[PDB]
Structure 1
Amino acid sequence: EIALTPQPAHLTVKDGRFEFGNQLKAKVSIRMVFESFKKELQEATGIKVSSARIILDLNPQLPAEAYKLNVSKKQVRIEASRPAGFYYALQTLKQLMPRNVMAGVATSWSLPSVEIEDAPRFEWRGFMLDEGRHFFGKDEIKRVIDMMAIYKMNRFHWHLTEDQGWRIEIKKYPKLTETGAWRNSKVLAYGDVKPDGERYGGFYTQKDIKEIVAYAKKKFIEIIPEIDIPGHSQAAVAAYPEFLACDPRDKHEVWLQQGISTDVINVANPKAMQFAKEVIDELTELFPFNYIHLGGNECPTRKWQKNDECKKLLSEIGSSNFRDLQIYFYKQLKDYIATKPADQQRQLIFWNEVLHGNTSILGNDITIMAWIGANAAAKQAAKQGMNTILSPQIPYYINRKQSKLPTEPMSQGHGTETVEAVYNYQPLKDVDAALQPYYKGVQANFWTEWVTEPSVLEYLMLPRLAAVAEAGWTPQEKRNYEDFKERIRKDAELYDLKGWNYGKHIM
């Protein structure tokens, strides 16, 4: 009957139903949010709402994303403290209606009376897409954002730079795309799989970026760009080897392989430093959200050990751990950002491998995205007074196989990462109440070594995405896989109407 995903914190079914009619009147940034709602509602149902049987009141004691939704025979009442809260209330309202309403599509109207009080458990409810390995483009990204918005996810992490490609136009360094965005293989080589010789790639112009930022903002999704440095940087090194390469005498090309590249940025070169600062400057212009992800995963120190300037620099900082070069590199970038005006300042996120270095050089106002040995890494981060986001490889990497069936498309894993396994992960299990404030939230990540087709992307994304979304929103004590299964089954219709692909295993 009522199938709400994410499951609200508190839901009480009440007497009777609220009948819309064909018109009604509403008492109300908030107006613009409601305006959007009105458009979608009219599109889907034909109901017109004039500017009262619907009231939106400001309740300043509610958290930033919280709301109350009271539906009775007489009236729909909504309370929230911020625009986002009102948006989420209206998401829930739509979800109380036939699926075509959430789909925004007319088909060939009442609400059940309810009392809802709702707030997200976590402020960070994210999805990351890797477009470095395979590029999907503007239309598909809009579809991804649409999927996220359904389940009240609010953070899109854009993994735009890799060994195998660079996907964002940087004005001051045009070769990043000219070289970095194109390569002579669609598939990425691994084991017996060899490069296929086909010219393949693509990138976003700064105009494209701004359009996608705007589109997401309308659905209260903030975009975090990732420029993954100084590892996972072979494409950038291929573009500008003279100052980025540790070994600029050697050949440097965009990588056609899967795996971990040793062709990392020369963090000791001064022009490499200037490059990074100027990239960050351009990002600051395109991305208004207050966070930047600088990566820091899987960065072999091997080439630094064979580089004279790097050996010298490591000596001057008085370290025996070549990992410290990476951390010192981040320090200079962090310091640089701190000199800029307040409105141009950005907080930094890193993958948890950065904890393997002497991080006290950086300070503790960084955010750690925990992926490998994630549970332990997050605890480690929280203990050091750092904020942390949980994105464990198992089971939050939703590019991994969701089934063992021989008919599944090719991707990583052995099919153990089922909807059930994703849902059953408990982010806060055995996490001391004193550490919990540092846990900003959760994220599903999607790596695209194997995934090249939008249809396969969607197939793997859904419905596991919704499970992570619910984990991020619904308090643990209110979560239940069997209940979730029953609720998510109702979204098959929504997916069909939207023309989204999805795994059918639990449908």
Structure 2
Amino acid sequence: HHHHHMAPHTIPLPAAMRVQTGESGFSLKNGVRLPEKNPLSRQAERIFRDNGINTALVKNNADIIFTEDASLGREGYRLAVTPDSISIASGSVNGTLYALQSLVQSIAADKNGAPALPRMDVKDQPRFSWRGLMVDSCRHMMPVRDIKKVLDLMERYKFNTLHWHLTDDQGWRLPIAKYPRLTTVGGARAQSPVIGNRNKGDGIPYSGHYTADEIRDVVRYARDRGITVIPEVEMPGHASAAIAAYPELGNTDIPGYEPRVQETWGVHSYTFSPTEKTFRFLEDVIDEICALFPDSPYIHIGGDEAPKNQWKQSPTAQRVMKDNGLANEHELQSYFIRRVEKMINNRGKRLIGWDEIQEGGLSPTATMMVWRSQMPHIAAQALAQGNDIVMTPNSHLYFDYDQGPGKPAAPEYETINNNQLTWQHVYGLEPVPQGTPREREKQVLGCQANIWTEYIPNLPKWEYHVFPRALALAEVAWTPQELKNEKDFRKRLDRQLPFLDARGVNYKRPDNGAPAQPKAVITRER
């Protein structure tokens, strides 16, 4: 025609999309009619209204037709938009969610400036099955209402996994009924590093945990948005809060044994003891995790950054090594993780751990979360041994890292280091390691960014660290590698900003690097 609709601004870019911008589209000026009997209409209602489009549940002659096609699998979908109807095909609920998110990101102005959808056809499915973000609730804790805002944005960009880092040295947030001190004692630290002066303590206690009903509410809310919540309980390291709560779980026979919920960032030395009592405790904890996260295919057990010195100094640990023919403390760690894997497997789930779990021997059935990009042989060795991996490289996907220029100099915006990890860097990530045999590519489950919160006290700063980098990651995680194009991505990114502004998201502006919400308050108060 003479009027051409704008092309969709969907991120991630769909694998196959045919838009006839000149043809007559579907008018949204009077809202969308949804079939009142289909449960998917309630999700369409939510997503359309999130984007300023009115909806009505109707008895007959709805505007949207939902169809079932098992060949689209867990997450694939088709879209067909004509002036007469919007047809959405999926093999599961989550494919319909993704179709709906693509639809609202295809809304364009008609001749008269009213919202419309162009004549278009989409067939789409993700490259990777694991498309994740990790929330660190230990260093700072975010309330449920803020996690829910995160999960809404994760669904918009087709993330399907929330890795919930729930226990560490500076706080334990996971409610365990049988061991209430884990949260009443382990959920509280006496102070935190001063903002802008990290080598000094602020003298202000910081405490909290999620109640069991809050855990279950987050899991359900996520599930309704296509997202599986995977819990992490850290062991054998990053354990100071649990050991402070129950000092018998640590290496009590070492010189100068003084556990506490830690008040400082970095690596700490308090590790779980490798005793029968500790394994009984861990089995009880794993049992309650399975009750809180009954649909999670995995339990993440950490496994990262566990210093061996306390085990070296502990006669108890040395005797366990001799009992079990273990030559060194790396083999002791492998033994520890093997015993916990049995607990997880006996409850029908799979173990995942940080790539340090290959120390002393990588279990043939574990899944490895690869983060140490300075050691590229670890992922290669894990793949060659047949193990599944999830790529969370600190070269590309550690979103505690700084970004490009433009941030405020104020101490509130300080970060762990001065590495600049830009959204452009993220967009250039290719998750499959070079040289991976074609037949082993299916072992690369996907990728995920980790948002460590030492320097991220609350949601406005979290948003600054995560958006727009998470949009680049969403495309890496979903879109075929050969369709990535940074120039086109930037055009689609710019057209996302009005939606993000309407929610007041404090993203890092692509144009000048400044916060989108420069007056947002960044504070530890809750």
> What TM-score does the superposition give when structure 1 sets the normalisation length?
0.91
Query: Among 482, 489, 492, which residue is 2:487 paired with?
Result: 482
Q: Which residue of 1 aligns with 2:520?
A: none
Q: Does 1:263 align with 2:266?
A: no
Distance 2:497 2:401 in 1: 21
Distance 1:375 1:19 in 2: 51
Q: Which residue of 2 aligns with 1:292?
A: 299
Q: Which residue of 2 aligns with 1:427?
A: 431
Q: How does 1:47-58 map to 2 (within 5 A)?
A: 47-51=55-59, 52=61, 53-58=63-68
Assess if the C-alpha contact under 8 Å between 2:28 and 2:116 holds in 1. yes
Instruction: Give the 3 Å change call, closer, same or farther, for CA 370–25 of structure 1 in structure 2.
Output: same
Which secondary structure state, in structure 1, belongs to the residue aligned with residue 182 of structure 2? Answer: helix
Q: How does 1:32-431 map to 2 (within 5 A)?
A: 32-41=39-48, 44-51=52-59, 52=61, 53-97=63-107, 109-187=115-193, 193-247=199-253, 250-267=257-274, 269-288=275-294, 289-339=296-346, 344-359=347-362, 362=363, 364-373=364-373, 375-405=376-406, 407=408, 409-428=413-432, 430=434, 431=436
Query: How far does the alpha carbon of each residue in 1:396-440 deviate from its partner, in whole angstroms, 9 at most, with x for none?
Result: 011210124462511123242011111111112523312201000
Assess if the C-alpha contact under 8 Å between 1:80 and 1:86 holds in 2. yes
Instruction: Please state how far the C-alpha of 1:10 moved relative to its aligned partner.
Output: 0.7
Let me know the Cα RMSD of the aligned residues: 2.3
Instruction: Give the 3 Å change call, closer, same or farther, for CA 471–368 of structure 1 in structure 2.
Output: same
In structure 1, stretches of 5+ residues that fail to align are: 100-107
Which secondary structure state, in structure 1, belongs to the residue aligned with residue 26 of structure 2? Answer: strand
Instruction: Please state how far the C-alpha of 1:183 moved relative to its aligned partner.
Output: 1.2
Assess if the C-alpha contact under 8 Å between 1:266 and 1:310 holds in 2. yes
Q: Does 1:448 align with 2:453?
A: yes
Distance 1:236 1:122 in 2: 35
Instruction: Please state how far the C-alpha of 1:202 moved relative to its aligned partner.
Output: 1.1
Q: Which letter maps to 2:56?
A: K
Instruction: Please state how far the C-alpha of 1:38 moved relative to its aligned partner.
Output: 2.6
Q: Does 1:472 align with 2:480?
A: no
Instruction: Give the 3 Å change call, closer, same or farther, for CA 407–245 of structure 1 in structure 2.
Output: same
Assess if the C-alpha contact under 8 Å between 2:31 and 2:53 holds in 1. no
Q: Which letter maps to 1:96?
A: S
Which secondary structure state, in structure 2, belongs to the residue aligned with residue 31 of structure 1? Answer: coil
Instruction: Give the 3 Å change call, closer, same or farther, for CA 188–31 of structure 1 in structure 2.
Output: farther
Query: How far does the alpha carbon of each residue in 1:288-319 deviate from its partner, in whole angstroms, 9 at most, with x for none?
Result: 21211000000111111111121122123223
Instruction: Please state how far the C-alpha of 1:150 moved relative to its aligned partner.
Output: 1.1
Distance 1:346 1:403 in 2: 40
Q: Which letter maps to 2:89?
A: E
Which secondary structure state, in structure 2, belongs to the residue aligned with residue 394 of structure 1? Answer: coil
Instruction: Please state how far the C-alpha of 1:63 moved relative to its aligned partner.
Output: 2.6
Distance 1:387 1:171 in 2: 33
In structure 2, stretches of 5+ residues that fail to align are: 1-5, 513-526
Distance 1:505 1:45 in 2: 27
Assess if the C-alpha contact under 8 Å between 1:228 and 1:294 holds in 2. yes
Q: How many aligned positions are there?
A: 490
Q: Which letter maps to 2:430?
A: Q
Query: How far does the alpha carbon of each residue in 1:113-136 deviate from its partner, in whole angstroms, 9 at most, with x for none?
Result: 111110000000000011111111
Instruction: Give the 3 Å change call, closer, same or farther, for CA 189–455 of structure 1 in structure 2.
Output: closer
Instruction: Please state how far the C-alpha of 1:152 moved relative to its aligned partner.
Output: 0.5
Distance 1:338 1:184 in 2: 37
Instruction: Please state how far the C-alpha of 1:244 moved relative to its aligned partner.
Output: 2.8
Q: Which letter maps to 1:452?
A: P
Instruction: Please state how far the C-alpha of 1:469 moved relative to its aligned partner.
Output: 1.1
Instruction: Give the 3 Å change call, closer, same or farther, for CA 81–185 of structure 1 in structure 2.
Output: same
Distance 1:189 1:299 in 2: 27
Which secondary structure state, in structure 2, belongs to the residue aligned with residue 393 of structure 1? Answer: coil
Query: How far does the alpha carbon of each residue in 1:221-263 deviate from its partner, in whole angstroms, 9 at most, with x for none?
Result: 1100100111000111111112333447722111111111111
Distance 2:186 2:262 in 1: 10
Assess if the C-alpha contact under 8 Å between 1:404 and 1:415 holds in 2. no
Instruction: Give the 3 Å change call, closer, same or farther, for CA 266–54 of structure 1 in structure 2.
Output: same
Instruction: Please state how far the C-alpha of 1:76 moved relative to its aligned partner.
Output: 1.7
Instruction: Please state how far the C-alpha of 1:22 moved relative to its aligned partner.
Output: 3.2
Which secondary structure state, in structure 1, belongs to the residue aligned with residue 38 of structure 2? Answer: helix
Assess if the C-alpha contact under 8 Å between 1:137 and 1:203 holds in 2. no
**Identical-pair percentage:** 32
Distance 2:384 2:195 in 1: 40
Assess if the C-alpha contact under 8 Å between 1:404 and 1:414 holds in 2. no
Query: How far does the alpha carbon of each residue in 1:180-228 deviate from its partner, in whole angstroms, 9 at most, with x for none?
Result: 1111213379986211110112110111111111111110111001001
Q: Which residue of 1 aligns with 2:518?
A: none
> Which protein has the bigger helix share?
1
Assess if the C-alpha contact under 8 Å between 1:379 and 1:435 holds in 2. no
Instruction: Give the 3 Å change call, closer, same or farther, for CA 441–40 of structure 1 in structure 2.
Output: closer
> What TM-score does the superposition give when structure 2 sets the normalisation length?
0.88
Instruction: Give the 3 Å change call, closer, same or farther, for CA 58–308 of structure 1 in structure 2.
Output: same
Q: Which residue of 2 aligns with 1:504?
A: 509
Instruction: Give the 3 Å change call, closer, same or farther, for CA 376–405 of structure 1 in structure 2.
Output: farther
